[PDB]
């Protein structure tokens, strides 16, 4: 039984965390820690099974240390007779983190508890020093670069409040070899958990903004905000109000500038928007009167010009069908025509309508977002399905367009979007286009349209951005 349970905890961190990690209360004695949805999400994200490198952009006044401690415990307690853990921090701050990890360890049952060799010996700063084997060492990040290089067979690095470590560039550079091509690859094959976990609240457009952006440009992990603490979701009268009054009360007895600083994890010197306002201000449009359908013609088709079309179909009322047509001929890609409509009550008459614009633009190849309606419209305008249109782009034969499976396509599609629009490789003419960009901002860990706005136009340009990366696109 013991072997099965130990192994169970070993590869199911959530179960280990919910069952064995305790706090010792004064009224109820040793009780189970009541994990929160954000903490549970964070535990899953930090595991050998998933990635290796994780970065959290969290707000302040979230009991993050409670989870970070449970993870670090779980790591050392279930390591394959191996592994050194070190943290980078300017304090005593890293000592506080390991204290909590020790608070977790000390409450474990015998069978899950490895024997303790060292434990804050000599009033440090360290547990399980020397072969035993796993260890956790609290370190100042200000010293290390020294701490990173000096470590012998490092397995995990946790970096507390990474955004508030001054002169981090050298310490960060020291980290690169430890993770990036890389003893990390070699240790991961051995099943060496560890790994690099960074968690902290943002601090302007420093080094961390670069880390978060590079991560978010590729993935959408991870960020929780004041609302993650569900206790805030109930007012004084003990009625659910979706943190309406707690937020009001917290805004008062303080400041709005302090509330974004403390409970929002927003970066200072910038809005959320994917496209910088510095660029959104320069963007001019071309006003045009659309057809009976939702077609806006910016520049008419020309013979011997190559066009590309992207289509983000509308799953329901809610939003619109968005078809951009982009002149691909020259070095600078211009948007020459857009179809924007929510009048398509029929799942059914769009393929023909779209086709005449695709045909109008020199048999324009089209890359359709494979959503429920997408897959759909795919078939009707397929070379084989109904309209026999031979210029429908597909990443596979099962998938007659852009498969939206796996997060990455949208991520890099947004990342390439940003580049294309900002470096002025792609020129947008549609008014409603740029207005959607105005509100297509951070929805950590991705981007979306804020309350009461549509992102249909922007999202179908994201498909173009993703398509932009593709080798086949390098001359459709």
UniProtKB/Swiss-Prot annotation:
Q: Name one GO biological process term.
A: viral DNA genome packaging
What job does this protein perform? The terminase large subunit acts as an ATP driven molecular motor necessary for viral DNA translocation into empty capsids and as an endonuclease that cuts the viral genome from the concetamer to initiate and to end a packaging reaction. The terminase lies at a unique vertex of the procapsid and is composed of two subunits, a small terminase subunit involved in viral DNA recognition (packaging sequence), and a large terminase subunit possessing endonucleolytic and ATPase activities. Both terminase subunits heterooligomerize and are docked on the portal protein to form the packaging machine.
Motif Walker B motif mapped to chain: 156-161
Q: According to the UniProt record, where is the region Nuclease activity?
A: 344-429
Q: Quaternary arrangement and interactors, per the entry?
A: Homopentamer. Interacts with the terminase small subunit; the active complex is probably heterooligomeric. Interacts with the portal protein.
Q: Which residues bind Mg(2+) 1?
A: 364
MF-aspect GO terms: ATP binding; ATP hydrolysis activity; endonuclease activity; metal ion binding
Q: Name one GO cellular component term.
A: viral terminase, large subunit
Q: What class of enzyme is it?
A: hydrolase
Instruction: Note whether Magnesium occurs among the keywords.
Output: yes
Q: What is this protein called?
A: Terminase, large subunit
Q: What is its EC number?
A: 3.6.4.-, 3.1.21.-
Provide the alphabetized UniProt keywords.
ATP-binding, Endonuclease, Hydrolase, Magnesium, Metal-binding, Nuclease, Nucleotide-binding, Viral genome packaging, Viral release from host cell
What is stated about domains? The ATPase region is in the N-terminus, whereas the nuclease region is in the central part. The C-terminus is involved in prohead binding.
Indicate which residues the UniProt annotation says bind Mg(2+) 2: 364, 420
Q: Motif (Walker A motif) spans which residues? A: 58-65
From the UniProt entry, list the residue stretches annotated as the region ATPase activity: 1-229
Per the entry, which co-factors are needed?
Answer: Mg(2+)
Q: What family does this chain come from, according to its entry?
A: Belongs to the Teseptimavirus large terminase family.
């Amino acid at each position: 039984m013991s072997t099965q349970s130990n192994r169970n905890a070993l590869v199911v961190a959530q179960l280990k965390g919910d069952f064995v990690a305790f706090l010792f209360v004064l009224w109820k004695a040793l009780n189970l820690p009541v994990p929160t949805k954000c903490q549970i999400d964070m535990a899953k994200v930090l595991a050998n099974g998933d990635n290796k490198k994780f970065i959290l952009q969290a707000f302040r006044g979230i009991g993050k240390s409670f989870i970070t401690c449970a993870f670090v415990v779980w790591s050392l307690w279930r390591d394959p007779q191996l592994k050194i853990l070190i943290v980078s921090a300017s304090k005593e701050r890293a000592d506080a983190n390991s204290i909590f990890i020790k608070n977790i360890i000390d409450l474990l049952p015998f069978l899950s508890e490895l024997k303790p060799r060292p434990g804050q010996r000599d009033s440090v700063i360290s547990f399980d020093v020397g072969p035993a084997n796993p260890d956790h060492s609290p370190s100042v990040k200000s010293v290390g670069i020294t701490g990173q290089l000096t470590g012998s067979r490092a397995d995990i690095i946790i970096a507390d409040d990474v955004e508030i470590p001054s002169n981090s560039a050298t310490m960060g550079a020291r980290e690169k070899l430890w993770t990036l091509v890389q003893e990390f690859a070699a240790l991961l094959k051995p099943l060496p958990s560890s790994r690099v976990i960074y968690l902290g609240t943002p601090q302007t457009e420093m080094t961390l903004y670069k880390e978060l952006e590079d991560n978010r440009g590729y993935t959408t992990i991870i960020w929780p905000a004041l609302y993650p603490r569900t206790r805030e979701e109930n007012l004084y009268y003990s009625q659910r109000l979706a943190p309406m009054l707690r937020a009001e009360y917290d805004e008062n007895p303080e400041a709005l500038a302090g509330t974004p600083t403390d409970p929002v994890r927003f970066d200072r010197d910038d809005l959320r928007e994917r496209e910088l306002e510095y660029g959104k201000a320069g963007f001019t449009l071309q006003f045009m009167l659309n057809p009976n359908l939702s077609d806006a013609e910016k520049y008419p088709l020309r013979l011997r010009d190559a066009i590309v079309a992207a289509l983000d179909l509308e799953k329901a009322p809610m939003h619109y069908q968005w078809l951009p047509n982009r002149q691909n001929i020259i070095e600078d890609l211009p948007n020459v025509g857009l179809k924007g409509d929510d009048l398509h009550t029929y799942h059914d008459c769009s393929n023909n309508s779209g086709q005449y614009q695709q045909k109008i633009l020199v048999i324009d190849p089209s890359g359709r977002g494979k959503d429920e309606t997408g897959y759909a419209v795919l078939y009707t305008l397929n070379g084989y399905i109904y309209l026999m249109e031979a210029g429908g782009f597909r990443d596979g034969y099962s998938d007659k367009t852009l498969e939206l499976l796996a997060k990455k396509a949208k991520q890099w599609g947004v990342q390439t979007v940003v580049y294309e629009s900002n470096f002025g490789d792609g020129m947008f003419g549609k008014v409603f286009s740029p207005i959607l960009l105005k509100h297509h901002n951070c929805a950590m860990e991705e981007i979306r349209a804020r309350g009461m706005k549509e992102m249909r136009i922007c999202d179908t340009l994201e498909p173009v951005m993703q398509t932009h990366r593709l080798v086949i696109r390098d001359e459709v």
